[PDB]
Structure 1
């Protein structure tokens, strides 16, 4: 599943609600591998709708349990990421992914 290790605490009370749009900054990295993406490196926050299955389960489940302003390291096992299939040319099969995520705003 997804494990959370807080980097910076949030307000501890404002969590993503159904339908809301999460505004996040993230950096993705293969466990014991290379970084493959960074919204911070291109200075451009990433947005996605909660509960609309727009992003892998682990990323959404991680964000869903974070409060406004919180930043955390998410460790996602393959079953809540890209599984046995992986992501063509970027994420190999059975890859555990590490995501440094910061919940910047809720829209």
Structure 2
């Protein structure tokens, strides 16, 4: 359940692959709710790789469906991220997650 709502520009040809460490300006958003996380604030744009189950499932699928310079809009189902448990005090159980994602990576 990954819905991409693309802010257009970029290249559309250089997709992320396995063995690649990539850099993402993310920004969290709760559906009918406020923010909960922001890479824009810390000024450290979250270096991470693909294929080690580092991030949640709903963020991992949308990262491969982007390219360099693109700006997407993730909409993840509750079951792929936190819906049964809920991250304690931060994410309630059975919650739908909204992300503002832009990929500006290397490799």
Where does structure 1 differ by over 3 angstroms across 4 or more consecutive aligned residues? Answer: none
TM-score scaled to structure 1, two decimals? 0.93
Q: Which has the higher strand share?
A: 1
CA deviation after TM superposition for structure 1 residue 85, in Å: 0.5
Cα offset, 1:9, TM superposition? 2.9
Tell me how far apart the structure 1 counterparts of residues 63 and 70 of structure 2 sit (CA, whole Å): 9
Q: Which moved more, 1:7-16 or 1:68-77?
A: 7-16
Q: Which runs of 5+ in 1 are unaligned?
A: none
Give 1:51 shift.
Answer: 1.2
Q: Secondary structure at the match of 1:61?
A: helix
In 2, Cα distance between equivalents of 1:104 and 1:8: 14
1:52 aligns with 2:52: yes
Distance of 2:58 and 2:43 partners within structure 1: 23
Give 1:81 deviation, angstroms.
1.2
Q: Larger helix proportion, structure 1 or 2?
A: 2
Structure 1 residue 37 displacement after superposition: 0.6
Equivalent pair of 1:26/1:40 in contact (CA under 8 Å)? yes
- Return the offset for 1:66: 0.2
Q: Aligned residue pairs: how many?
A: 107
Deviation at 1:32, TM superposition (A): 1.2
Distance 2:87 2:27 in 1: 16
Deviation (angstroms), 1:83: 2.0
Could you list the per-position Cα deviations for residues 26-73 of structure 1 after superposition, in whole angstroms to 9, with x for gaps in the alignment? 101111111101101222201211011000011111111001111111
1:26–1:101 CA contact under 8 A, matched in 2: yes
Q: Contact 1:2–1:80 (CA<8 Å) still a contact in 2?
A: no
